[PDB]
């Protein structure tokens, strides 16, 4: 075989920011990374992060009518990626948000970017340290389903996944 994968540490650097809501004023809270999509290093054996594959939250009402759409959009089935999505629902009380690790691993992915990632599923967490929530999918229907992603946050009372998507 040829298994192997070593995180570049930074994966935690960006994760430590995803755990918390890096914001403050009204001109920042909207610029929160709703989901950070990672990607296997060039070496093909090191867990690292991307540069231009992170969807914000304010985009929903800034330059993106559908934020959740941007995800699956750049979430092909030929490229296993790791994303830390933080769905925002509005139950019978007030708008909230739940951080989750949308484990995107398309079973139809390339063995040259699948045999690692898959087996890497545990290697990555080595840095996450038992991530709170999670949601692994292998189909646009499973990843592009509000009801599904709304399960990790509690879709019992959730009237919407963003006052629109649901």
Asked whether the beta carbons of 162 and 107 are under 8 A apart, the reply is no
The token duo for 132 is 């709170």
CA atoms within 13 A on the CB side of 56: 17
Beta bridge partners of 35: 55
Which residues make beta-bridge pairs with 134? 101
Give CA–CA dist 70/59, Å, rounded.
Answer: 10
* Technique used by the depositors: NMR
Domains held by the chain: number: 1
Domain with 46, as residue range(s), is: 1-166
CATH number (domain holding residue 49): 3.40.20.10
């Amino acid at each position: 075989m040829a298994s192997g994968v070593a995180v570049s540490d930074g994966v935690i650097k960006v994760f430590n920011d995803m755990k918390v809501r890096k914001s403050s004023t009204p001109e920042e809270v909207k610029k929160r990374k709703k989901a950070v999509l990672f990607c296997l290093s060039e070496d093909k054996k090191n867990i690292i992060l991307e540069e231009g594959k992170e969807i914000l939250v304010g985009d929903v009402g800034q330059t993106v009518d559908d934020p959740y759409a941007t995800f699956v959009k750049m979430l092909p089935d030929k490229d296993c990626r790791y994303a830390l999505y933080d769905a925002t629902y509005e139950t019978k009380e007030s708008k909230k948000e739940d951080l989750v690790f949308i484990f995107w691993a398309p079973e139809s992915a390339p063995l040259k970017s699948k045999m690692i990632y898959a087996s890497s599923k545990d290697a990555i967490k080595k840095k996450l340290t038992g991530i709170k929530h999670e949601l692994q999918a292998n189909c646009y229907e499973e990843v592009k389903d509000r009801c599904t992603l709304a399960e990790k946050l509690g879709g019992s009372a959730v009237i919407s996944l963003e006052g629109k998507p649901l």
